[PDB]
PDB file of C-alpha atoms and ligand atoms in Angstrom:
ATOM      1  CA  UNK D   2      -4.705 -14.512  -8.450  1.00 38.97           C
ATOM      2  CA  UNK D   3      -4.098 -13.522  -4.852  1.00 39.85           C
ATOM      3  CA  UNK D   4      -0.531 -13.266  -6.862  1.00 37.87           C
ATOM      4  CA  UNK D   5      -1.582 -11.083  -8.983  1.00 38.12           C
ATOM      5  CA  UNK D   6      -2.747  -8.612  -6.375  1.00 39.95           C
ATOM      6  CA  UNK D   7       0.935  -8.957  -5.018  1.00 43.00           C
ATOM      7  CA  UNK D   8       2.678  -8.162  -8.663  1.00 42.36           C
ATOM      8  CA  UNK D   9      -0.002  -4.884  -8.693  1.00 42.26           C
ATOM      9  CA  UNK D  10       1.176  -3.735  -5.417  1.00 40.03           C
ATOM     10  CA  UNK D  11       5.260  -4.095  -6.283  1.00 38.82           C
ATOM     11  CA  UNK D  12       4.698  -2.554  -9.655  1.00 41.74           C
ATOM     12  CA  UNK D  13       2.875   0.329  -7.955  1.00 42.25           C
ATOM     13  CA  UNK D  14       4.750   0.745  -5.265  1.00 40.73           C
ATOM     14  CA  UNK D  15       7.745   0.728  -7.720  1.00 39.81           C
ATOM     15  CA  UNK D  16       6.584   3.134  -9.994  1.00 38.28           C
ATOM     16  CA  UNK D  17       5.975   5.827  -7.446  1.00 38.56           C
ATOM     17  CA  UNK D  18       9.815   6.339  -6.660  1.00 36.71           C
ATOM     18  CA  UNK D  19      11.666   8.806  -7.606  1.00 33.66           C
ATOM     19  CA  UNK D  20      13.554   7.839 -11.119  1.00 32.57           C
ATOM     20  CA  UNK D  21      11.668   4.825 -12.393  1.00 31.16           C
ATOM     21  CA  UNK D  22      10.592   5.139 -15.576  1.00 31.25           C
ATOM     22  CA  UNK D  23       8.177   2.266 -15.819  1.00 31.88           C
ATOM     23  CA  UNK D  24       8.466  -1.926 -14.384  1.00 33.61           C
ATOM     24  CA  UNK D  25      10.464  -3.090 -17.211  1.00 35.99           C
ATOM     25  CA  UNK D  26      10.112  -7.046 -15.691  1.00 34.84           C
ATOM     26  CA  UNK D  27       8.576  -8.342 -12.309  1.00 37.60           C
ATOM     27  CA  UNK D  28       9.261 -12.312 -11.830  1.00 34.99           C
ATOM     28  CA  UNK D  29       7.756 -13.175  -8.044  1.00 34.77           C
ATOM     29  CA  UNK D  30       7.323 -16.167  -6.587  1.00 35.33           C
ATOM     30  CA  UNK D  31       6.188 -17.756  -3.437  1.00 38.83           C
ATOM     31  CA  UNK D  32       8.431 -19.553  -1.088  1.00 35.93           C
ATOM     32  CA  UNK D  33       6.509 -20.676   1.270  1.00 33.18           C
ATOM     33  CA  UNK D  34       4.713 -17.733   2.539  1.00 29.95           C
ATOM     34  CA  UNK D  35       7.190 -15.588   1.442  1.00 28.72           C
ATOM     35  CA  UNK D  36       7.600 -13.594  -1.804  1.00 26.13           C
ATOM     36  CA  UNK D  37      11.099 -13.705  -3.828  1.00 25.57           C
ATOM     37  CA  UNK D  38      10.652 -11.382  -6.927  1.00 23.04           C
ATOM     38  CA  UNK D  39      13.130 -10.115  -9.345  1.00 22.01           C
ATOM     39  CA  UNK D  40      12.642  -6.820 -10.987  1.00 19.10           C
ATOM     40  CA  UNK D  41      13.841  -4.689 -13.739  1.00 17.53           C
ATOM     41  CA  UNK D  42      13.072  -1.011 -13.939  1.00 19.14           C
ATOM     42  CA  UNK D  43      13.335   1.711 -16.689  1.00 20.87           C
ATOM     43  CA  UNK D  44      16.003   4.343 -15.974  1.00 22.30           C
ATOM     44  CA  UNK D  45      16.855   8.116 -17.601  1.00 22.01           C
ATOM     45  CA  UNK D  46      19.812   6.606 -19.918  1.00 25.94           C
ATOM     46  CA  UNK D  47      21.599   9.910 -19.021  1.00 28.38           C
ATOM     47  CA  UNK D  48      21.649   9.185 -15.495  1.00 29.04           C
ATOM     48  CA  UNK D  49      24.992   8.038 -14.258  1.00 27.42           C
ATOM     49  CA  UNK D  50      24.948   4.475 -13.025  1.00 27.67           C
ATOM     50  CA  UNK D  51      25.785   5.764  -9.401  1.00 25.66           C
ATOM     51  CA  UNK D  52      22.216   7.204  -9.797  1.00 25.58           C
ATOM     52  CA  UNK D  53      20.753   4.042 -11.522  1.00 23.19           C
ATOM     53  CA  UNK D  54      21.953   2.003  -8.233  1.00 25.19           C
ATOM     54  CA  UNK D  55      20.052   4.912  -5.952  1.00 28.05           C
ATOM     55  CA  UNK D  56      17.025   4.500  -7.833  1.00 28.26           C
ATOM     56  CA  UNK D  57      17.561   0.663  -7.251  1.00 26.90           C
ATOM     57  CA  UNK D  58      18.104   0.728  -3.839  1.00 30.49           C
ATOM     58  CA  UNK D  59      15.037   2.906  -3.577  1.00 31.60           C
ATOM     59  CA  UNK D  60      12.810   0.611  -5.235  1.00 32.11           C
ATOM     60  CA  UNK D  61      14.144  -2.072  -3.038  1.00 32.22           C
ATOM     61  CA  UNK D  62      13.424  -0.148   0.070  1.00 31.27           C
ATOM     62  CA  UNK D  63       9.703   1.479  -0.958  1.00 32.08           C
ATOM     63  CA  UNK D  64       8.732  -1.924  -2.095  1.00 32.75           C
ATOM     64  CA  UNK D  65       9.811  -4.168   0.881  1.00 29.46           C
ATOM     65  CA  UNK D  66       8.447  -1.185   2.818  1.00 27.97           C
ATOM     66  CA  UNK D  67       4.841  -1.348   1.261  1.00 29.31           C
ATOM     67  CA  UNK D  68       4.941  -5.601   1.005  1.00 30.13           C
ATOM     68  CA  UNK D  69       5.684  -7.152   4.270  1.00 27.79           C
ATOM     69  CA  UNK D  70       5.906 -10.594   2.573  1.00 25.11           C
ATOM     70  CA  UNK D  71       8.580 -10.052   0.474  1.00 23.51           C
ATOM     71  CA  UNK D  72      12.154 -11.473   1.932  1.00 22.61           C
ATOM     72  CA  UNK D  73      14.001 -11.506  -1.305  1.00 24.54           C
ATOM     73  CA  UNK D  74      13.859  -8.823  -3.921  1.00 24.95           C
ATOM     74  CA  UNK D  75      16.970  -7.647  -7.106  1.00 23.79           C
ATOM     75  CA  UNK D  76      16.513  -4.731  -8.601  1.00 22.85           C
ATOM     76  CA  UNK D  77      18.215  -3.811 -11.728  1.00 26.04           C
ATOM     77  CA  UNK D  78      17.863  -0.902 -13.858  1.00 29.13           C
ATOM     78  CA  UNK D  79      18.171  -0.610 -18.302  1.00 25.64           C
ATOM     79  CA  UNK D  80      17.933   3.207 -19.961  1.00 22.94           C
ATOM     80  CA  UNK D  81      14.480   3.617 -21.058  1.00 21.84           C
ATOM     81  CA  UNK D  82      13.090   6.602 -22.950  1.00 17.62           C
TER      82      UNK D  82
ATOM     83  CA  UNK I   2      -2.886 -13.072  11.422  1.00 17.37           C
ATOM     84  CA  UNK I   3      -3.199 -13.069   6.838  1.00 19.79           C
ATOM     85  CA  UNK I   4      -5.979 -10.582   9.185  1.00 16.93           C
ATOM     86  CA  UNK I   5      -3.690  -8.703  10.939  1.00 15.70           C
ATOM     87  CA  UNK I   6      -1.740  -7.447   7.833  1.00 18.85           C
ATOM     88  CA  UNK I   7      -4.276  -6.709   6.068  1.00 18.90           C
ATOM     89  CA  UNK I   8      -5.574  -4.602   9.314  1.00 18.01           C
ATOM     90  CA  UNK I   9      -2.456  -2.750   9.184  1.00 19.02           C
ATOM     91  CA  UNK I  10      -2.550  -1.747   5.937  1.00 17.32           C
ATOM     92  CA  UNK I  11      -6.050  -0.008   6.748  1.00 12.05           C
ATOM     93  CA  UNK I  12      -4.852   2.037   9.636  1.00 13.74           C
ATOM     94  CA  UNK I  13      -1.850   2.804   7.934  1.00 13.15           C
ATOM     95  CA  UNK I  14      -3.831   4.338   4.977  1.00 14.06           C
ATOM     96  CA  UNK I  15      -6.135   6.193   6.870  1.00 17.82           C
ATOM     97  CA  UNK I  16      -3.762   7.614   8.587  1.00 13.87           C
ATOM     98  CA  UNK I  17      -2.024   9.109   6.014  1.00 12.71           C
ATOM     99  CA  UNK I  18      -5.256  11.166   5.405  1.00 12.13           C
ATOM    100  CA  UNK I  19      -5.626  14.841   6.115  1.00 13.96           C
ATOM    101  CA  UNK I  20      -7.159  15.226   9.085  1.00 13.88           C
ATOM    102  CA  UNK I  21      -7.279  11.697  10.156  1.00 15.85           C
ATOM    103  CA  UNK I  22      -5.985  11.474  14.405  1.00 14.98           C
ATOM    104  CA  UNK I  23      -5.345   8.320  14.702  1.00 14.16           C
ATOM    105  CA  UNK I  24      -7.562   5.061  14.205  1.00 13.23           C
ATOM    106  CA  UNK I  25      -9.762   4.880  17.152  1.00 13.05           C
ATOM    107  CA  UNK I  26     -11.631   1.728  16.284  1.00 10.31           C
ATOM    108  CA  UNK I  27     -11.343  -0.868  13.235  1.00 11.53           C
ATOM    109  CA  UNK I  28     -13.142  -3.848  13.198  1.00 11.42           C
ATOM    110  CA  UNK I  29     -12.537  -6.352  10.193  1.00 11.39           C
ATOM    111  CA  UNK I  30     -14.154  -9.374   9.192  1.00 12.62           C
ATOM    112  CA  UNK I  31     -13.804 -12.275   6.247  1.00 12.98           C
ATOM    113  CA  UNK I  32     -17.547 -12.511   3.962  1.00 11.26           C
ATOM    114  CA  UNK I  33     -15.851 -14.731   2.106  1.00 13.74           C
ATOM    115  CA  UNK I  34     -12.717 -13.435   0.353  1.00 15.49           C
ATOM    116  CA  UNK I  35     -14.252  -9.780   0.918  1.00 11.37           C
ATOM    117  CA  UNK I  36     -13.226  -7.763   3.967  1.00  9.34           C
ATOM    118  CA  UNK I  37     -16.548  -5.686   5.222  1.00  5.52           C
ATOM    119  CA  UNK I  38     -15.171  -3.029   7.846  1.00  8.67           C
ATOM    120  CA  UNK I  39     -15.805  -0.664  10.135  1.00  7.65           C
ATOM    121  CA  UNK I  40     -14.366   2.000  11.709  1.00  7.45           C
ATOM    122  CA  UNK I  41     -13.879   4.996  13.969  1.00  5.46           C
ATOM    123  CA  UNK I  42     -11.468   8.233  13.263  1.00  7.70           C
ATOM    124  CA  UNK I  43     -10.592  10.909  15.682  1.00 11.03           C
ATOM    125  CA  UNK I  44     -10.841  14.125  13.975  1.00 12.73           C
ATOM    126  CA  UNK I  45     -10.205  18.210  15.730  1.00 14.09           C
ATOM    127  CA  UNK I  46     -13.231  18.712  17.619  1.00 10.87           C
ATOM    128  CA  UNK I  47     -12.967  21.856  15.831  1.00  9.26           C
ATOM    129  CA  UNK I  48     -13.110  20.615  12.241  1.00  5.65           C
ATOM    130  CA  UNK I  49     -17.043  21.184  11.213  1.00  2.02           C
ATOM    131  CA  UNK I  50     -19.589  18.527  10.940  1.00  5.22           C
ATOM    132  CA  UNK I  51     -19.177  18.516   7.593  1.00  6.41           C
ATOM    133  CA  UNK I  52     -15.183  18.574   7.051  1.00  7.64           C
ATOM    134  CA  UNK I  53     -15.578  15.537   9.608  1.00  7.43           C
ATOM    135  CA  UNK I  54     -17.632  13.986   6.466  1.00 10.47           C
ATOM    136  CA  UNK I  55     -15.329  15.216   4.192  1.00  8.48           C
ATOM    137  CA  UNK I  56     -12.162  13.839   6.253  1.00  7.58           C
ATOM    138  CA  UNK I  57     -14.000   9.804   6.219  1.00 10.99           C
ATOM    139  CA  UNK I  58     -15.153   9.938   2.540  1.00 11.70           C
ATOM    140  CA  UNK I  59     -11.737  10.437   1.688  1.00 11.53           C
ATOM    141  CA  UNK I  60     -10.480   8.094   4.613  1.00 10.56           C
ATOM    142  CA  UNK I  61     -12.983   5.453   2.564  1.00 11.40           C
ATOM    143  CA  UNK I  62     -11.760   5.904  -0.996  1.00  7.92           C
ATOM    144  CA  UNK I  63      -7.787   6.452   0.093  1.00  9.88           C
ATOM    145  CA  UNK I  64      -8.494   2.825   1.989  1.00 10.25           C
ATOM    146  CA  UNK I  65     -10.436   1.062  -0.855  1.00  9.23           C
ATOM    147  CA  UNK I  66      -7.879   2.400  -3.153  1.00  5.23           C
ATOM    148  CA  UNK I  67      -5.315   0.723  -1.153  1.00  6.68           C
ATOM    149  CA  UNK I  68      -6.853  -2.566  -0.171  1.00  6.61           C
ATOM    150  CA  UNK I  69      -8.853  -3.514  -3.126  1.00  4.19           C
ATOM    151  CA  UNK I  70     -10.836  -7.047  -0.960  1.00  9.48           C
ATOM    152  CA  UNK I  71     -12.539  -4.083   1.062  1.00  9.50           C
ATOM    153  CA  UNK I  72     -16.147  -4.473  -0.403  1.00 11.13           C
ATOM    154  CA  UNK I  73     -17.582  -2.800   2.732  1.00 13.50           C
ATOM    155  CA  UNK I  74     -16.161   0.064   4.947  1.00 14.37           C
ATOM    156  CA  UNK I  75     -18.053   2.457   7.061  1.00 17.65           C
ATOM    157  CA  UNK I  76     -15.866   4.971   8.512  1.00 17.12           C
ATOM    158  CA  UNK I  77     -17.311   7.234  11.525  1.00 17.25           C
ATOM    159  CA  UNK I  78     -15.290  10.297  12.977  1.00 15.61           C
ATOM    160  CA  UNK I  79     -15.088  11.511  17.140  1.00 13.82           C
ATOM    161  CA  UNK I  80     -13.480  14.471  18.448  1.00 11.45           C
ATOM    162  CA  UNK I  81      -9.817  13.762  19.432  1.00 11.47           C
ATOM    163  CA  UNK I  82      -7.092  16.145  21.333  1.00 11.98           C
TER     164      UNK I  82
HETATM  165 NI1   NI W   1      25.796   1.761  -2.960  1.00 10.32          NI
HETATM  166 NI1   NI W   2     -21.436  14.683   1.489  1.00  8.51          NI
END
């Protein structure tokens, strides 16, 4: 539950880039001290998929930025409406 | 030092408040798994008494937003160049 507080902040922090279009799926886990967390976001399906890795990279970036625990996180984007 | 992030978060938020010149003072302590703070803002000596007010309220709720453990935080203002 001091998880869960974790998963709240990188769904937030997620959701306030540019692009995302909702925290599809958010699978983190603790190594150690350190977070490792896997994440699908939601995506404009008429955005090109140059765009979709942006967005990506964004999230990455905004999230590791906001969560200093974090040392691993993928990002991966699907078209949703 | 679980402390010291969660101490940087605080100034961090506050000092994304308008208004907000720096953290002068923050003091944070454990009651339990609650963190009770206090702390100091500098503010425009020029601002009024009461947009000084105005500037901590919203320096409280943009921090308690943030960091949900807060269950206590007093937040004082003093004129800074
Ligand atoms: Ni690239
Ligand atoms: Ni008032």
């Amino acid at each position: 539950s001091h998880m869960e507080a974790v998963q709240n902040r990188i769904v937030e922090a997620a959701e306030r880039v540019p692009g995302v279009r909702g925290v599809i799926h958010l699978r983190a886990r603790y190594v150690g001290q350190d977070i490792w967390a896997d994440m699908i976001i939601g995506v404009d399906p008429e955005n090109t998929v140059e765009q979709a890795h942006e967005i990506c990279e964004a999230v990455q970036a905004a999230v590791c930025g906001k969560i200093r625990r974090i040392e691993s996180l993928h990002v991966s984007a699907e078209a949703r409406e």
